[PDB]
């Protein structure tokens, strides 16, 4: 019975893979329509399609129980069946499932329709996060203006959806239990296929905390000289609204005021991008070039015909948060980005294009294997290229960085600017899932949900709100991914493993030798390296066909997620920075925040 049944099973899967691909295509199309044009109508359609696919997924789960799949010889077949048993939200009773979609939709659409009044003109009330409020948080050095925009934004994107958030936690939890995980924490963590994963990340975070604390301390020092001691204390958490970003996840936008050597060059090519007439189209074409230059795959025509790479001008509602989309056919991949001509946006274009490349690289695989080896792998791909693009080396080659001397002081400036984006983010990213895990697991009482957020943010990042908050506010959904039910640990894993890929890609490209001051890891450009491209191909082409350790091994021979590489990259900075903090008697650490009242 069992040798025969295994042969039938292979044909069952082959055939079922194709059907899921096609049914997902339709669901994706409806999601796309909504996300690119928010209306009551498109909401209904997206939600009804999803409901129907959920119903089919349930029959598929049920059909898995008819096959003796755990007894089969083929690891590969067992892997595909295992994946089909994991329903996620689709396990919910029909009505509960529809209620959950309506709750998610309410939250995501609240986020995307937020608008605030101009600080200087309360008649003018149509400022959106993207682009208006983002530009003020990133450019203004008026602490009171900054604080105003912070409060207006968090009040509308966060507090306004407490009731919905709460319902979502209930449903998320119910759904996980139906799949027999303890909570949604364990449902998310199952993607990493490793029991010790949480512990591994705590270990890695603990090894990098000291460097993070040195950075924190230095930035605080510099902010005090800018804003004065009335605005920033020596010993407390940094007021977050001064850190150049609405969530303080990255601080690179205040590099003008905290850079180690302000006499020396600090790389910001936005102004040159605008002077040379760059458009979004050019930016995407440069990204394409980067990948084709490494002998990877060209964007297909469908990409250019159907992508949305600039913010519509018909004043409609849409989700402007940048995203990459697989449509599960052949060569139908798309990006929706409300692209602006800046350095940071050029990196985002590479980031998103990294997802697109992953899609194209694994599109021959069976449907259940057409995703990342783990979610962090997907988010890392494009960032490995962004690491290169951001190098002075690369930016001189493309004519965006003019008259740059690469002295020791400019290296330090560049290193620190990178650290503001890459080290700073790690605690931030860890907290976004720690908060949510703690609610999913039932560890925090509803009475304390807002202060448990800011508590994590204090303990891990050493920041706090500009104003006093309380349990009358609900601040966590003011972050896109929280409002939209996007797991965030992927981004923590990405910011660690991308240094492992980059370092390895740099070695393959000839651009990095430890024992050679002409090839330092932080000036490595892998543009043009078919040797780097080959490693990418070997790993990305695998999809989720094997456990992620085997995908990493395809790239570089390793099997372990490790913080060695990111430390190696920042080692030069750490040595200078420790010494500079001691030279200036810089206070390190912070007192417990007093900005969330229970
Ligand atoms: C999450 O964990 C849940 C437990 O916390 C789990 O729920 C259980 O799922 C079981 C599915 O295996 C289910 O098992 C069956 O139960 C039938 C009787 O149960 C009733 O009585 C209970 C009290 O006694 C009530 O509380 C329930 O509500 C039920 O109404 C059994 O009659 C049934 O049996 C048939 O199935 C087996 C088939 O199993 C195998 O397959 C082949 C052949 O098909 C065999 O050769 C093989 O060795 C093995 O037999 C047959 O052996 C048998 O002859 C019958 O045809 C079966 O045992 C159980 O009821 C349910 N329990 C509870 C408490 O809910 C969820 O499944 C988990 N969810 C996920 C997503 O994994
Ligand atoms: C947005 O979608 C609506 C349907 O709710 C449609 O009629 C409208 O014209 C759309 N706008 C664009 C530009 O797609
Ligand atoms: C480029 O990729 C192809 C597969 O598309 C491979 O066969 C070949 O070896 C690579 N070429 C170069 C320039 O190494
Ligand atoms: Zn991404």
Numbering used by the authors: 17 to 614
Mind quoting what the paper says about this structure?
The dipeptides with a C-terminal tryptophan (IW, VW, YW, RW) show an identical conformation of binding within the non-prime subsite, with the tryptophan residue occupying the S2 subsite. IW-1 isoleucine and VW-1 valine sit within the S1 subsite, forming a hydrophobic contact with Trp341. IW-2 isoleucine occupies the S1′ subsite, forming hydrophobic contacts with Ala338 and Thr364. Due to the similarity of isoleucine and valine, the interactions within the S1′ subsite for VW-2 and IW-2 are conserved. Based on this, it is likely that the difference in the dipeptide affinities towards AnCE (IW: 0.08 mM, VW: 0.17 mM) is influenced by the difference in hydrophobicity, with a more hydrophobic side chain being favoured. The tryptophan binding within the S2′ subsite is conserved between IW-2, VW-2, YW-2, and RW-2, where the tryptophan side chain forms hydrophobic interactions with Phe441 and Tyr507, a π-stacking interaction with Phe511, and a H-bond with Gln266. Out of all the dipeptides, IW has the highest affinity for AnCE, with a Ki value of 80 µM (0.08 mM); this is most likely due to the AnCE subsites being relatively hydrophobic, with any polar interactions stabilising the dipeptide backbone. The difference in affinity between IW and VW in AnCE is likely due to the extra carbon atom in isoleucine, which has an effect on the van der Waals interactions within both subsites, potentially further stabilising the dipeptide compared to VW. The S1′ and S2′ subsite changes between AnCE and cACE could result in higher affinity binding of the IW-2 and VW-2 dipeptides within these subsites due to the changes from AnCE-Thr364 and Gln266 to cACE-Val380 and Thr282, respectively, resulting in more hydrophobic pockets.
Angiotensin-I-converting enzyme (ACE, EC 3.4.15.1) is a promiscuous zinc metallopeptidase with a number of substrates, including the vasoregulatory peptides angiotensin I and bradykinin, the anti-fibrotic agent N-acetyl-SDKP, the neurotransmitter substance P, and amyloid-β peptide. Here, we present the use of the Drosophila melanogaster ACE homologue, AnCE (which, in particular, shares enzymatic properties with cACE), as a model to study the structural basis of ACE inhibition. The active site is located at the centre of this channel, marked by the location of the catalytic zinc ion, which is coordinated by His367, His371, and Glu395. The high-resolution crystal structures of AnCE in complex with the dipeptides VW, IW, YW, RW, and WR presented here reveal dual binding in both the non-prime (dipeptide-1) and prime (dipeptide-2) subsites of AnCE.
